Amino acid sequence: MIVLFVDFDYFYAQVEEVLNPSLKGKPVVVCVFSGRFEDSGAVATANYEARKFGVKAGIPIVEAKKILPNAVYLPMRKEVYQQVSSRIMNLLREYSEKIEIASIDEAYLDISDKVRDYREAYNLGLEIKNKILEKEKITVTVGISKNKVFAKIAADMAKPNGIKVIDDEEVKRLIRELDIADVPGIGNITAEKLKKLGINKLVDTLSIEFDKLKGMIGEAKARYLISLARDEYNEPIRTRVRKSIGRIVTMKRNSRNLEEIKPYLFRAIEESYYKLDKRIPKAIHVVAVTEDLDIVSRGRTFPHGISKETAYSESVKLLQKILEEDERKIRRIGVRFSKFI
DNA sequence: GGGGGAAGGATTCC
DNA sequence: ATGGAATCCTTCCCCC
Ligand SMILES: [Mg+2]
Ligand SMILES: [Mg+2]
């Protein structure tokens, strides 16, 4: 087995530079605007003309408008990018039968019985990377090696517009050598939790006790971080399927009142419930985000699927329950839907 | 002790 | 200040 992964360069920033090319060349910032204050919100994607001056997914729109005030500010057009993305999902599968769609902007492939070798890898990788563009005007980064994870790194350190090759010699050579905060799945928090455990790389996971790893990360990551310090890992292109569908919104005011919380809430449902189309959720969850900026949700499963009425109904129920075991002030309030038939 | 879940918080990504 | 859709992982309880 051998895996090629392909990522979509700053997806969102780009779809929009295919819809309006007068955009290309210049700074571009897709964001998510709240209602709170004029231009209230967070950046969501930015191209390199933006990222390069400090503007990145995460940051308040206002502390962007600070750094590059004459950037093009665009609201988030999600659906518009899901479809485009899917058009490219099927062109990808135009090569592979066992495709793995990791997210709207990422997906892995077993070029296995298709390509045996890094000659005929870099070849066909590139193969697809001009076709995605030609047939769609959209640009990626492809990367090569033995497993999922190891391909993502290939892509991560060559993106954007890039093609990474990685000898199963360097699968190792990485381990010993590479920073570990750069591990698919390893964020700030775990990276953090990890130098306190002494670990700065992969290989360094074989020193330290493992039952001490346990409560520091969980066996989860544990074994996971461990298998990769072996050259093994070797885990196969699953299919994968949306598990949850949610939609979370933000209210013109922190609040604790139900007739004040219901409309936002009830909106989340409509929105979530139209994104469901053809799936029956066996479980719901309302997720409020504390005043003081912490999450507090409250799920519930049932022995069948949930009709919007039920969804409407249990939802207030989850919501009060939350106004109980708590009493700050709920700013953002929303809903997920899980265990689909 | 643990299988089999459901509930809840926490962490990752963009 | 701090959007958001989504998953991941810990603990809880039920009962064999
Ligand atoms: Mg991307
Ligand atoms: Mg990271």
Encoding tokens for residue A293?
Answer: 């900026």
CA–C1' distance A185–C8 (Å)?
10
Distance of alpha carbon A40 from alpha carbon A38, whole angstroms: 6
Last residue of a domain, one of A166, A185, A218: A166
Residues A6 and A154 placed together within one structural domain of the fold: yes
Distance A190 CA to ligand 2 centre (A): 9
Give the closest residue to A294 by CA, choosing from A330, A337, A248, A246. A330
Which of A178, A224, A186, A235 has its CA nearest to residue A203?
A178
CA A116 vs. chain centroid, Å, equals 30
- Of A233, A255, A283, which residue sits at a domain end? A233
A90 touches strand B (CB under 7 A): no
| Residue A174 sits in the same domain as residue A86 | no
Resolution (A): 2.3
Q: Experimental method for this entry?
A: X-ray
β-pairing, A247-255 vs A295-301, is unpaired
- Into how many domains does chain A fold? 4
Angstrom distance, A309 CA to C14 C1': 30
Statement to judge: residues A16 and A134 lie in one domain:
no
**Closest nt by CA–C1' to A192:** B11
| Encoded amino acid at A20, one letter | N
Strand B nucleotides within 7 Å of a protein CB = 5-14
Pairing of β A295-301 and β A330-340: unpaired
Ligand 1: distance of its center to the CA of A103 in Å?
9
Cβ atoms of A201 and A191 within 8 Å: the answer is no
For position A64, which CATH number holds? 3.40.1170.60
Q: Which CATH number is A182's domain given?
A: 1.10.150.20
- Look up the CATH number of the domain holding residue A300: 3.30.1490.100
Q: Three-state DSSP class for A249?
A: strand
Kindly state whether residues A127 and A214 are assigned to the same domain. Answer: no
Domain check: are A132 and A65 in the same one?
no
Cis peptide before A160 (omega within 30 of 0): yes
- Reference A45, options A74, A70, A88, A69; nearest CA is A74
For residues A171 and A148, membership in a common domain is answered with no
CA dist., res. A77 & res. A249, Å (int): 16
The span from the CA of A61 to the CA of A34, in Å, is 10
In a domain, A239, yes or no: no
A6 with A96, same domain: the answer is yes
The answer to the question of residue A94 being in a domain is yes
**CA distance readout (Å), A163 to A127, A143, A145:** 11, 6, 12
Task: For residue A153, tell me if it sits in a domain.
Answer: yes
Residue A235 CA to nucleotide B6 C1', Å? Answer: 28
Q: Is residue A70 part of a domain?
A: yes
Looking at the structure, do residues A176 and A82 belong to the same domain, yes or no? no
On whether the CB atoms of residues A27 and A50 are closer than 8 A, the answer is yes
Q: Which nucleotide, over all strands, has the C1' atom closest to the CA of A152?
A: B13
Look up the CATH number of the domain holding residue A122. 3.30.70.270
- For residue A238, is it within any domain? no
Q: A116 with A89, same domain?
A: yes
Domain check: are A51 and A182 in the same one?
no
Do both A16 and A67 map to the same domain?
A: yes
CB A132 within 8 A of CB A138: yes
Bases of chain C below 7 A from a protein C-beta are 1-10
Cα–Cα dist A110/A238, whole Å: 11
Domain boundary among A52, A77, A102: A77
Give me ligand 1 centre to Cα A64, in Å.
Answer: 20
From residue A60, how far is each of A26, A33, A247 by CA, in Å?
A: 20, 10, 20
Domain hosting A153: range is 2-10+78-166
Cβ within 7 Å of strand C: which of A 80-109?
A: none
Identify the sign of the CA torsion A254, A259, A264, A266: positive
Same domain, A137 and A6: yes
A247 Cβ nearer than 7 Å to chain C strand: yes
A224 CA to B14 C1', in Å? 23
The reply, when asked if residue A105 is annotated as ligand binding, is yes
